[PDB]
Amino acid sequence: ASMERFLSVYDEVQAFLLDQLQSKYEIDPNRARYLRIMMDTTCLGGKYFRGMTVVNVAEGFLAVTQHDEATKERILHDACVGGWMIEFLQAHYLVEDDIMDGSVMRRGKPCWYRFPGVTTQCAINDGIILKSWTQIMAWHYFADRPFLKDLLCLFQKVDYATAVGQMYDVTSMCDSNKLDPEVAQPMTTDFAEFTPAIYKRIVKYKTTFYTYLLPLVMGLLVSEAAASVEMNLVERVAHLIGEYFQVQDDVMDCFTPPEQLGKVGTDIEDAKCSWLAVTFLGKANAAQVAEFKANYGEKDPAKVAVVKRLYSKANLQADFAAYEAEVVREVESLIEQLKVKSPTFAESVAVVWEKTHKR
Amino acid sequence: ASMERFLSVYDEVQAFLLDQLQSKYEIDPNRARYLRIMMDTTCLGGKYFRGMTVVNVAEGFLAVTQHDEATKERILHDACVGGWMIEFLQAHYLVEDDIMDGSVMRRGKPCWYRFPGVTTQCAINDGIILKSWTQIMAWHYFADRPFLKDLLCLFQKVDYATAVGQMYDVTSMCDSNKLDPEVAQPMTTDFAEFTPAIYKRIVKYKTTFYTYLLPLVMGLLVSEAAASVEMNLVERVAHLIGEYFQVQDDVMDCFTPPEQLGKVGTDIEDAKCSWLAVTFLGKANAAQVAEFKANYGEKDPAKVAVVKRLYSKANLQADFAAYEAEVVREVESLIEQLKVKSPTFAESVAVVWEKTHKR
Ligand SMILES: [Zn+2]
Numbered sequence: 095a096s097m098e099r100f101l102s103v104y105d106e107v108q109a110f111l112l113d114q115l116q117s118k119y120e121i122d123p124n125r126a127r128y129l130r131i132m133m134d135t136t137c138l139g140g141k142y143f144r145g146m147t148v149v150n151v152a153e154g155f156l157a158v159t160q161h162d163e164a165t166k167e168r169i170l171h172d173a174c175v176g177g178w179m180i181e182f183l184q185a186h187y188l189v190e191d192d193i194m195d196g197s198v199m200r201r202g203k204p205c206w207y208r209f210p211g212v213t214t215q216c217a218i219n220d221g222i223i224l225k226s227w228t229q230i231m232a233w234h235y236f237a238d239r240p241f242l243k244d245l246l247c248l249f250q251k252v253d254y255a256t257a258v259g260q261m262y263d264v265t266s267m268c269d270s271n272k273l274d275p276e277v278a279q280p281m282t283t284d285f286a287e288f289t290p291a292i293y294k295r296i297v298k299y300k301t302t303f304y305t306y307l308l309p310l311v312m313g314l315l316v317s318e319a320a321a322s323v324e325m326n327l328v329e330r331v332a333h334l335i336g337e338y339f340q341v342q343d344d345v346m347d348c349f350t351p352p353e354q355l356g357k358v359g360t361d362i363e364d365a366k367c368s369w370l371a372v373t374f375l376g377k378a379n380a381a382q383v384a385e386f387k388a389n390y391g392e393k394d395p396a397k398v399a400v401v402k403r404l405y406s407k408a409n410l411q412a413d414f415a416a417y418e419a420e421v422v423r424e425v426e427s428l429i430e431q432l433k434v435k436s437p438t439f440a441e442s443v444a445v446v447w448e449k450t451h452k453r
Numbered sequence: 454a455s456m457e458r459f460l461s462v463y464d465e466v467q468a469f470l471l472d473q474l475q476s477k478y479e480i481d482p483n484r485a486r487y488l489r490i491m492m493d494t495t496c497l498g499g500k501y502f503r504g505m506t507v508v509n510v511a512e513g514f515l516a517v518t519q520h521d522e523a524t525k526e527r528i529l530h531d532a533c534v535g536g537w538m539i540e541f542l543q544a545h546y547l548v549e550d551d552i553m554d555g556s557v558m559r560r561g562k563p564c565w566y567r568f569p570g571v572t573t574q575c576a577i578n579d580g581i582i583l584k585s586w587t588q589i590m591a592w593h594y595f596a597d598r599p600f601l602k603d604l605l606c607l608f609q610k611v612d613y614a615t616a617v618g619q620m621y622d623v624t625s626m627c628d629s630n631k632l633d634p635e636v637a638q639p640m641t642t643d644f645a646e647f648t649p650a651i652y653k654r655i656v657k658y659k660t661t662f663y664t665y666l667l668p669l670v671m672g673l674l675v676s677e678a679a680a681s682v683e684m685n686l687v688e689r690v691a692h693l694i695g696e697y698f699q700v701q702d703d704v705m706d707c708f709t710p711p712e713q714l715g716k717v718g719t720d721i722e723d724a725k726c727s728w729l730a731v732t733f734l735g736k737a738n739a740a741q742v743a744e745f746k747a748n749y750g751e752k753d754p755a756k757v758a759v760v761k762r763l764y765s766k767a768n769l770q771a772d773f774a775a776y777e778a779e780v781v782r783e784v785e786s787l788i789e790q791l792k793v794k795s796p797t798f799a800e801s802v803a804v805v806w807e808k809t810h811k812r
């Protein structure tokens with residue numbers, strides 16, 4: 095099974111990385127144990143959606159391409175290693191973002207930096223190591239692969255887009271004209287930058303490149319199948335599915351219970367440019383806008399409750415259903431376009447969409 | 454002149470990175486200005502020793518190798534770009550280490566995260582971007598170069614060694630047998646791990662790979678001159694010069710005035726495994742060891758003054774002069790060995806040593 099193979103490769107990559115630290119980096123057993131626990135705590139426990147997408151894409155191509163059995167195993171092992179590069183990249187982001195945001199919980203457990211024997215002093219460097227491990231994996235497992243350069247160059251571009259998206263995300267509540275390293279950043283009072291286009295820019299860079307584009311293209315690269323798809327369609331369909339995925343997450347941060355969500359949602363307190371805030375501002379009357387301005391971006395629970403009450407009374411379920419119906423049309427249109435060059439890849443995209451649409 | 458060329462390339466790399474953010478990453482002018490100021494503040498103001506080493510190594514080879522003028526300019530431009538990759542890598546380290554350590558000053562100015570309009574929330578991601586910029590430079594400027602893969606693989610290995618060295622450094626005051634993510638880390642009471650071999654391990658990984666090995670090998674790679682030197686000698690001479698460089702820094706942290714140093718030294722308060730602490734423990738009597746244990750790793754200025762008094766009374770200048778005389782013998786021995794295959798490269802190493810020995 096796909097999952098069973100994916101998790102087995104985790105054991106092999108972990109053993110490789112820790113054994114190399116022993117043989118080449120003069121690590122002592124206690125520090126190797128610290129790093130093993132750090133890797134398990136930060137990389138495991140999620141659904142592995144991103145990593146599994148590489149595996150699923152590669153499985154789609156194996157079903158229709160002639161290969162020796164040893165080659166089928168090599169491609170699947172490459173898809174698992176590539177999937178783990180993305181999961182470790184995500185682990186790097188989550189560790190650093192939780193420190194950046196002062197987050198309390200992640201995957202129902204404390205954020206890594208909050209573990210007693212970790213602290214921010216270690217955790218920032220642990221997050222750096224998680225990303226360095228992605229490059230050590232690539233150079234070791236893909237040393238002789240024809241796709242090595244394309245995969246490293248794609249991974250680098252996606253990682254950079256993600257860091258730019260993090261900048262767009264954490265500065266989304268400030269007025270662009272007031273950004274200045276020398277001056278403490280006040281929260282916007284006009285919310286003029288809470289628009290659908292600005293929100294789409296945040297999401298495109300902060301989430302879509304590493305969550306959808308990267309696993310899909312990595313699946314194509316380990317399959318030596320990129321010159322079989324129209325890359326502009328892959329980009330357009332990744333950015334559409336990714337935006338939809340983030341809109342679902344934005345809704346959950348506010349309305350999904352803390353136990354089911356795994357963390358207490360703070361987008362309102364943090365004054366984030368969320369789908370709820372943008373969509374609310376896209377339909378509110380003057381009085382509702384004024385009430386939103388007087389309560390948004392404050393830690394005070396009474397003001398948070400006012401914002402949640404404005405969202406609930408604003409019937410945002412109607413806007414969400416209208417957005418969803420539109421995304422369904424556009425995603426189906428793009429899947430259809432993907433069938434011209436590759437019905438196999440289009441089917442993999444259909445599965446990725448189905449898995450996103452239902453969660 | 455070498456410096457004039459190096460700084461001119463900074464302008465070109467900066468323009469390239471910011472223009473690409475505009476044309477490909479949908480950046481707005483205010484965020485591009487934030488990032489320009491972040492790049493200038495974190496990358497400029499130092500001596501550019503690491504970056505200049507790549508340039509100097511490449512200049513050494515140009516003096517003895519036949520090339521068209523356009524090729525000489527291309528090699529020098531490649532050496533400057535490669536030098537800037539190392540300076541930006543250092544900038545990434547300094548930004549994250551200052552956050553990790555809660556440092557106040559850097560290069561006589563506040564640490565980046567302390568700027569009013571930055572904050573840790575942005576600065577951790579700014580440090581990530583600085584390292585991502587090193588990869589964007591490499592893929593853009595060296596796209597068609599024969600040395601691209603060797604340079605990227607070397608850079609990745611050095612960066613990973615550095616992050617491992619940071620882990621060794623920040624955990625150097627804890628007992629290895631007590632490292633555990635679940636348990637808050639107490640400072641050692643026995644100081645059994647304050648040994649010359651353990652100190653050499655910290656320094657080798659945290660400093661020597663990125664400060665000496667990387668600039669020397671990058672100089673060889675942009676010169677297409679690696680298969681002209683014995684790589685085991687380059688590694689041995691980089692780790693010797695690097696260790697000497699770090700011992701000088703350790704002495705300065707304690708005895709160099711805060712104004713000349715640029716920051717208030719805190720190695721004693723931080724209980725760092727410094728050359729002074731290891732060397733002191735290598736010659737102290739039982740009473741002196743007991744006094745050191747009762748005062749080391751405490752923020753209290755009276756206890757700090759006791760440790761400084763123990764160091765001053767311990768005549769560590771004698772140990773330093775004996776260490777220096779030994780390093781002089783060994784570095785000269787390695788330079789001599791380097792002349793068998795390349796008198797040109799040995800001369801570049803002699804210059805690197807001279808520049809380290811005098812500062
Ligand atoms: Zn965040």
Ligand SMILES: [Zn+2]
Binds near residue numbers: 343344347
């Ligand atoms: Zn969220």
Ligand SMILES: [Zn+2]
Binds near residue numbers: 554
């Ligand atoms: Zn440090």
Ligand SMILES: [Zn+2]
Binds near residue numbers: 702703706
């Ligand atoms: Zn120091």
